[PDB]
Amino acid sequence: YEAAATLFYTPGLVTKRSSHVRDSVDLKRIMIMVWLAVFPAMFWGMYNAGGQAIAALNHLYSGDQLAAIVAGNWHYWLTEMLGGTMSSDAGWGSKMLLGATYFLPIYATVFIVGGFWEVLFCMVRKHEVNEGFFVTSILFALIVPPTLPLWQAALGITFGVVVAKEVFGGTGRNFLNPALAGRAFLFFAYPAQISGDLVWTAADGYSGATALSQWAQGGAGALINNATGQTITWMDAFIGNIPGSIGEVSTLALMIGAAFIVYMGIASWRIIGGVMIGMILLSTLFNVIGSDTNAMFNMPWHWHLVLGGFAFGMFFMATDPVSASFTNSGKWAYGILIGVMCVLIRVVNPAYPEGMMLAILFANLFAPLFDHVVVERNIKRRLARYG
Amino acid sequence: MEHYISLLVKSIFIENMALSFFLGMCTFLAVSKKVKTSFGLGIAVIVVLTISVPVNNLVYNLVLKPDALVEGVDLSFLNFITFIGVIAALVQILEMILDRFFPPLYNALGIFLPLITVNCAIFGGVSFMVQRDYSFAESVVYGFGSGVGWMLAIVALAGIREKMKYSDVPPGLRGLGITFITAGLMALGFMSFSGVQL
Amino acid sequence: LKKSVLAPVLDNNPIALQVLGVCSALAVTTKLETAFVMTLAVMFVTALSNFFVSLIRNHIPNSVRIIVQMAIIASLVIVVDQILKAYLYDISKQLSVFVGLIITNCIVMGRAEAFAMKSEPIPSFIDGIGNGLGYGFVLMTVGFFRELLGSGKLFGLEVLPLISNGGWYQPNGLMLLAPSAFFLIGFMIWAIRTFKPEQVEAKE
Amino acid sequence: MSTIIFGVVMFTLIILALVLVILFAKSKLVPTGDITISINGDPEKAIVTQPGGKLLTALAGAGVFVSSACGGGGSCGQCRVKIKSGGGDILPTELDHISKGEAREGERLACQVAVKADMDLELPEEIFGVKKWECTVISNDNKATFIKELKLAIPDGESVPFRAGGYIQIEAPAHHVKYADFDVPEKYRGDWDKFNLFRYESKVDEPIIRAYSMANYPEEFGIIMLNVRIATPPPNNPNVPPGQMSSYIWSLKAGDKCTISGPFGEFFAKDTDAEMVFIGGGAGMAPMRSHIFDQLKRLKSKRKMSYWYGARSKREMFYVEDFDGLAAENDNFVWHCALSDPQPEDNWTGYTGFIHNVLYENYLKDHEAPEDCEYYMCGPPMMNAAVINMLKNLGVEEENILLDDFGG
Amino acid sequence: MITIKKGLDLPIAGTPSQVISDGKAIKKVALLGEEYVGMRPTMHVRVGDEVKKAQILFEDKKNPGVKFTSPVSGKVVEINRGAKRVLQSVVIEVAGDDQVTFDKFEANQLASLNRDAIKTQLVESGLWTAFRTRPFSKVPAIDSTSEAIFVTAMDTNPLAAEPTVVINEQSEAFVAGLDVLSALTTGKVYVCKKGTSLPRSQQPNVEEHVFDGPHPAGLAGTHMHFLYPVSADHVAWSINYQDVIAVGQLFLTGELYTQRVVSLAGPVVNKPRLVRTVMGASLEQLVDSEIMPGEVRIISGSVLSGTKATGPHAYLGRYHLQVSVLREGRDKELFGWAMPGKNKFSVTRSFLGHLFKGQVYNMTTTTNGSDRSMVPIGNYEKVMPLDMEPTLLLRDLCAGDSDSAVRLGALELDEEDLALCTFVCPGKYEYGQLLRECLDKIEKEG
Amino acid sequence: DSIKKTLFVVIALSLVCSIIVSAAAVGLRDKQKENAALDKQSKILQVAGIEAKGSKQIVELFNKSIEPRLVDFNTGDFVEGDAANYDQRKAAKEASESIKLTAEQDKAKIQRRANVGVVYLVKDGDKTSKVILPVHGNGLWSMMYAFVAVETDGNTVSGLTYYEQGETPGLGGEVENPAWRAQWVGKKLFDENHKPAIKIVKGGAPQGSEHGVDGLSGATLTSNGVQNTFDFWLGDMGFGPFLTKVRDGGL
Ligand SMILES: Cc1cc2nc3c(=O)[nH]c(=O)nc-3n(C[C@H](O)[C@H](O)[C@H](O)COP(=O)(O)OP(=O)(O)OC[C@H]3O[C@@H](n4cnc5c(N)ncnc54)[C@H](O)[C@@H]3O)c2cc1C
Ligand SMILES: CCCCCCCCCCCCO[C@@H]1O[C@H](CO)[C@@H](O[C@H]2O[C@H](CO)[C@@H](O)[C@H](O)[C@H]2O)[C@H](O)[C@H]1O
Ligand SMILES: Cc1cc2nc3c(=O)[nH]c(=O)nc-3n(C[C@H](O)[C@H](O)[C@H](O)CO)c2cc1C
Ligand code: FES
Ligand code: FES
């Protein structure tokens, strides 16, 4: 296929003009390097989804009632058919199968439905199909609960691609994050398939909360795994033995991938440091002033980090080059606003348990204002004849 | 002092006039091309609200409130005409003062008073002050915070529209349609402050 | 003849060409009944204010012109408000602030200042009716879409059986919130300037 | 009913108080004072008028008026004045016409200047003597099928001071003219009878002003000769009103009285030793003949010159005797004509086709340095565009291409 | 003194050996018309005309008075014109040794001359085209003056020659040229160089400044940014060291000095070195029998800001002091965008080539990718030492905005001042063309 | 001259517009008040179980069957006053007839309480068979208002209706659901020790309970608000003493 032959082979083009020798990096390698960095998080997310599902299933049902439940759900009987087991003694392979039967359909739906619009726009406007949709598709597929209906995933990727990105010009022409604008579509439009106690562990009939909702109710004494009856420790949330959105759960794996993409100079350590600074400052302020009726006022800086999608968005979605600031001094303010707003929506906003898509979507509107401030400080230096 | 800071930050962020109530959306979407003009317009709107809301509070409490002038009569069917006349008169006199006495400030901000002479932003601010039944200090703080929030929103839209000089918009959307979509995404972003009760 | 009435629908549309009149379109289009009542009210006010300002156009002094025009318009809108509260009380509660915001609505004042001041009594009523027709066209399109996809109803009649009352449809949540009106009007402008490409704006 | 009267009185008092407060703040905050506009830094003779007004109108009433052709609107862009201290802004309509290079020097179009404070100007010296006249039409004969060669005489035998290429302005009061009185001879009556323009009639209810380029070079004293084309409605839209000023000029006959106003001009010839190439067509014969006769009789220059005129047929050519005489007397001047489509009655033995193609093929295709001569051009906009494209494709700069488009 | 922190010393194979060895005799020279910014010529010679050295060949229409004279004596053999009859080169077949001789002076009389006499001699000789204003990098009008004349006595382009190795032969001419420039300057004269020593001018106008670091630093734009920031009100001139040598030789001996010492080097040059050559020589005859066989690309100047030498442009430029020959890369490699690059160069760290320090690369003329949109990952800030916002300026150039580019600092740059930003672009943009279009707009309108 | 003409035009236009406006506004006051009362009257008739279609039918059935009263909250007994035109919101906002609830007493997050509350008695002749209590509390997005119709036993509920809630239309706006509001008929409010017993059970209430109501699914933060509403308005600070009196008898 000639249209698919653009991905395998290099273009084989020469330089026509000013700089007869070019660098070796392109946008294809950049996007594939960012795509390969979410693989540890993806695989641990599949493993965790399978393990949480099996544990919660063996909590409620046991005996001949597991038979009627695993024979009524195609994920369960397909795992048992391919070879896995749904008993309590399932290994690490039977859990990755069960997590794959949830991640792979969502990823395929997102990829196909988003690529359709990508190709349609780039074909009407007479362009080559631009990479950088791989990143959007894989990120949208891993910031979602294990139990989305596929039609909602299709609607969300449609909104994220068309409205947020492709209606402005395409890759490198927008101002907003496409993946977090497709999840804000699904969050505020269909709000019960992406919130509550019934959407985050893929076990039929199991209702239980996540740890940023058990902290809001009781604090550090309420963190407990109802499927097993044990206290959620710090190393559980750090490693990622907790329920939540498919890939957000493993801070260790996210750190491993982000260290790679930050060493290579693709992601911005300035933005990452700004996010960390803002989070630490605001969380310490809240810990200092304190509150009696609010239990999120005493969550320290090292608990905000390992819970929710802070490390998934600090590392992979805040560092989006097109939506961030374009100045070295504006990137610090961008990250600081992101962290401050995340901690603020976590603590003093009662309706939303976390606030990272909504903290980044807010800072995406004020990044150009930080750019304007910095460049207008620069322009006055030039008029004084010192720059 | 906690009751007046809460009102200020609420009017600035939790209830933005331009992105929550959508008051003044023609000047908002029309004058959002340059941050300089947007800044001047936001300053003019701040001044006009700060002057207009407390004066209308005084006039209402003195004349237009039920049982305020004669025990048994209700003159609230004059709220609309009274408010709009006061707003127009104040704006025109402010423009004339700034023109004759301070042309430096006139060129700066007094040029945008003809646009906000009869604007939905100020009239909606007064109509909301009437519903909320504020005191004089609360009216002052509410007007000031509302003006600051409107200025913030319009300056952010202008900055985005200047960032969009690199964009490639379909011909049918270039102009108004992409501005409408941009403002919609801005409101979607500002929905972070929904559940906050301040 | 009727060209003056039928032009603003698609040719020179207020909300889609001359930005005048956006706040009510964004606010009251969550329900088709409120959208229709607001359409009728704006037609009424624009037409009558045009007629009266054109009748007295020659004696209005330029020094206090704004006061006179705003007085006429505010009187019209106050009468309309006192009539809505007495006969349509369920819709006035839903239109509370934007019933009175017709005074500062830009369509009314623009058609009073631009056309009515330098024209004839009868054609001013006609221009008001035309501008109200275009404004109501936009309102009713956006309201149709938002009320059909956000709640499954039209004017209060269940067209799509919701999933609570044993139905197949699950309503959209954004169609009752802020950004949906912006998106709908933007794609409406797209679809308009695709068929009438003389309205497309210059490149740079 | 005790609240109806109260509400009525309250409404009346509120509105009256607002109106009175506005009027009082108006009476204390408006200057209502004079303004002393000095047209030049040196003289004491300044212009003291009321504040509210436009600069061009004030200057015209004062007695120093610039060549405002479009009569307001900035369509022509000719009310160019230079302010050194005045209105501190450039309104976008004028900012289009004035580049960054001139706008910095304080220049502005006079039409949309806002006179609100004391402003001082710097005007050129050729505007002070711009006095009008009361002329008498000698003849209005027909030299082309659609062009009337008007000839005006200045009273007291006073030749107007102008340069080859200038243009007077002509005033026409409100009047009505029928196409029945237009005098066309049986030579040109053919296309008239074919198209039925005789059904047309004008309608002007306000005095208007237009510009017309003189066809006489200065040494021909006491004459103002024009070459006026008829501004007939296009052959596609016959219901549109016809050419006001053109119809009036065609209505002018022998012996009548007409008023012309001042010598103007920007399309002038450069003073160098480089070859000159005139490319005229249609009604653009007036400035071309002025330039050629000037350069050949008044200055007696030796620069190599050439004239290239286009025509729809051999009946459209005029001034041919004068140009043949010039080419016979002088060795520098050599001219050539080219017809678009000839007729068999003319027995044409010469160049055919469009004038840009004729010039390119016969002269410019083999010329050594097509970029070293100056090109003066005036004619229809299609011919203008075609010739400019041909010269730019042969590699000629815009500084040498000096054209004059008759109002776009 | 001034230590540049951000930049890029490009590791490319074929660094020359700084030893001046004589070069192949040349038979044709030429003046390249498309290299003088904003120049429209008035030809004075026709094909077949015998010329003398320093005899006028054409003048400028947009710059009255400036003459472009012949580098050698011979016979005009070709006048290559291209699309819309744009002049490309005026070739001259070398024959004879006649010339035009000017007035002579001594070392004592050179520092107290008149600006008018100096201008007449320079313009009549043709060395006036060695000067370049800022902004717009045009030849100065013969009636203008500038308070800052910048001598560029350092070269940091890849594979470039060493100014010291050349100046240690013409020390006397160099000092005399500095004296002439100090008499011409009306302000000061800035000799920007490296740490090492140079011949010195005793005048108090001449000042030696030292610059250190990687290369955005052998450029006159860095020197102007750090010593005399330019705008529309303040223009500064620019000249290099061999042209100062030529000015000194002119004002000492009377006759024009058209010798050069270029550095012929590159990845595919059999033996890189410095070849003593003539001014405006032919590259096809300068490089023959000295290149590895294959499909190569000859360049007049560096590989960052240099002209391809094909057909009518195959002659040494006016402001170019080196030749760079390198192969042509046209082969499509399977998954080449994904192979771990042990032999690939990048300013990022996504290849394995950065771990091997001091490694050198045999680079070719490939764009290692296709044309995309600018996703800014911060590569322009790594190679921009000046006090500007790189990505915002670059986006204001790509967008087509002239006012905002001028505000952000586009009047301080030349096409060579964005060569590294063109180098490190993932979207394969070419910013010299965009900057030149912006400067043409600014100069034309306004 | 000019000033006189401006004054004359302004005054004439102002008199005309003022006559028209002040005539239109004063002639519709009674109809506006009647329309404002019709809404609450119809909602109360819906809670009481009386079917009424048409405004005239609503007015007739309300004036026949319902009987508004005024109740003191501290002593829990009727008081003498204009019951048909009482405005409890103004009475709670006014610092004369309202008490400020401290943080330990404000279970429902209302911050104020009017001393005199209005209740309605559903009569058929002279005997009283029900009583409709207006209760309210705070939920996630807005203050929710309800009508609870408890029987003359003081314990058994006969119906319930949320007429002003303002919450997400499909998660927590299901307080207006018919299938959720039908779970209240037959429910008892107090235990044998006369303490509040209504419980909104998270996860579903046991089939056939006496004090168990299903919680809203996906909305635990509006269910908490309903539970707090009832915890307040069934305690000592709300309808506690009045409900004790009703249980003792005499209604
Ligand atoms: C410096 C200068 C020198 C000039 N010298 C000459 C000269 O020597 N000779 C010469 O003949 N002209 C000359 N002109 C052109 C000058 O403008 C003429 O007067 C021109 O012929 C217009 O004449 P008019 O006023 O009668 O036309 P107008 O009345 O101004 O215009 C009528 C024309 O426009 C069309 N038209 C009118 N109204 C409408 C409408 N509502 N919609 C559509 N189309 C409409 C008509 O069909 C007709 O073609 C010169 C112009 C300039 C600026
Ligand atoms: C990326 C690596 C760099 C990060 C460097 C570490 C930055 C730390 C800066 C804050 C230092 C103090 O750290 C902060 O102290 C607070 C109190 O002040 C402690 O907080 C603890 O005590 C407070 C006292 O009221 C309790 O309310 C709170 O619930 C409990 O967690 C936490 O341990 C931590 O949140
Ligand atoms: C470090 C890096 C981070 C990125 N993060 C995102 C992201 O969070 N969401 C998304 O849709 N695309 C992301 N992209 C892809 C690309 O930047 C995105 O399409 C831009 O927003 C262009 O519209 C990223 C790319 C890079 C190089
Ligand atoms: S500006 Fe037109 S409605 Fe507010
Ligand atoms: S009046 Fe002629 S240009 Fe404005």
Author numbering:
A (entry chain B): 27 to 413
B (entry chain E): 1 to 198
C (entry chain D): 7 to 210
D (entry chain F): 1 to 408
E (entry chain A): 1 to 446
F (entry chain C): 6 to 256
What does the paper say about this structure?
The Na+-pumping NADH-ubiquinone (UQ) oxidoreductase (Na+-NQR) couples electron transfer from NADH to UQ with Na+-pumping, generating an electrochemical Na+ gradient across the inner bacterial membrane, which is critical for energy-consuming reactions such as rotation of the flagellar motor, ion homeostasis, and uptake of nutrients. Na+-NQR is the first enzyme in the respiratory chain of many pathogenic bacteria such as Vibrio cholerae, Vibrio alginolyticus, and Haemophilus influenzae. This enzyme is an intrinsic membrane protein complex composed of six subunits (NqrA–F), encoded by the nqr operon, with a total molecular mass about 200 kDa, and contains at least five redox cofactors (FAD, a 2Fe-2S cluster, two covalently bound FMNs, and riboflavin). Since Na+-NQR is exclusively found in prokaryotes and is structurally unrelated to mitochondrial H+-pumping NADH-UQ oxidoreductase (respiratory complex I), it is a promising target for highly selective antibiotics.
